[PDB]
Amino acid sequence: EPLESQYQVGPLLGSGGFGSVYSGIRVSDNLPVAIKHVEKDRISDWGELPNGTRVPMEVVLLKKVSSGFSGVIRLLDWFERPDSFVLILERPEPVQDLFDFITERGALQEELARSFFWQVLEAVRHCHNCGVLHRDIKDENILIDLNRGELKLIDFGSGALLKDTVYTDFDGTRVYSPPEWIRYHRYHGRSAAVWSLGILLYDMVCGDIPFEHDEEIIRGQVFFRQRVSSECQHLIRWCLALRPSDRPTFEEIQNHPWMQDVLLPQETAEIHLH
Numbered sequence: 001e002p003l004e005s006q007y008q009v010g011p012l013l014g015s016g017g018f019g020s021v022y023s024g025i026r027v028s029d030n031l032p033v034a035i036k037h038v039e040k041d042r043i044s045d046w047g048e049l050p051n052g053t054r055v056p057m058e059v060v061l062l063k064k065v066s067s068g069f070s071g072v073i074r075l076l077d078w079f080e081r082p083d084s085f086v087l088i089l090e091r092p093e094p095v096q097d098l099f100d101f102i103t104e105r106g107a108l109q110e111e112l113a114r115s116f117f118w119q120v121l122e123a124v125r126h127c128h129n130c131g132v133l134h135r136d137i138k139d140e141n142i143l144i145d146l147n148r149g150e151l152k153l154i155d156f157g158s159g160a161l162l163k164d165t166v167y168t169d170f171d172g173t174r175v176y177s178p179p180e181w182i183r184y185h186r187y188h189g190r191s192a193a194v195w196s197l198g199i200l201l202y203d204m205v206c207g208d209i210p211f212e213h214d215e216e217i218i219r220g221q222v223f224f225r226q227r228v229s230s231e232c233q234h235l236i237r238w239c240l241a242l243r244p245s246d247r248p249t250f251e252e253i254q255n256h257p258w259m260q261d262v263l264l265p266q267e268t269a270e271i272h273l274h
């Protein structure tokens, strides 16, 4: 079979709502890869490629964003099996997700959080550009290429095609979901994304997410548990405005005073990762 011969399976890296993910190598050129299995019965959202073939939405979305270079994990190949689909994905090495990174480091220095957050913004802009809404932005779905200091977005399994009309479905992470989802089961793509970016930024500079319960999300009152500059607090509170239309655009986020003078990825690595 074209799967078992082209790739050499290694250790299981993780398992969960996303399926089972294995470390692996492409046998030809020894490129490191990740091998992700999803059972068909466990798949909720289906999509279709330009031709007839019906695939997981995730494959559709990944092909739309996997063109060229970016802060998005590249889809190298996919295979269909009788009861599952198998995805072949890029694997940086060495690598660590941002969740684990924050677990080990605690709250991030603002200089480091600025660099990370900037790269997340460019990746998300890229997705929206390609007509893709990720819908599950959070520290676990962000990989750090430790050598290069480059961040990479992963797991489009809760994603959707970007549209200008309302969304009434959501299967991403609840504590990163906006108050309009909690209260009305309605949200629009960009402003729901910006809310989750606000959660992420708080997570980075405080070492934990700001809200646990539905009622806290709805109240939208932000308490800073760690020392954070006034400019950073302001950006966070702006992303977390209760009224969707009160939140910044990607452009306003990147023109914010706190976002100025970002480090390059490589110097971020030299100063903070090496």
Ligand SMILES: FC(F)(F)Oc1cccc(-n2nnc3ccc(NCC4CCNCC4)nc32)c1
Pocket (backbone or CB within 6 Å): 013, 014, 015, 018, 021, 023, 033, 034, 036, 073, 089, 090, 091, 092, 095, 096, 097, 140, 141, 143, 154, 155, 156
């Ligand atoms: F971490 C590795 F790079 F080694 O693993 C990869 C490499 C490339 C892609 C992925 N992906 N892509 N979608 C994923 C969904 C879940 C997932 N789970 C294992 C990770 C382990 C640590 N980081 C968060 C989850 N990995 C995924 C995982």
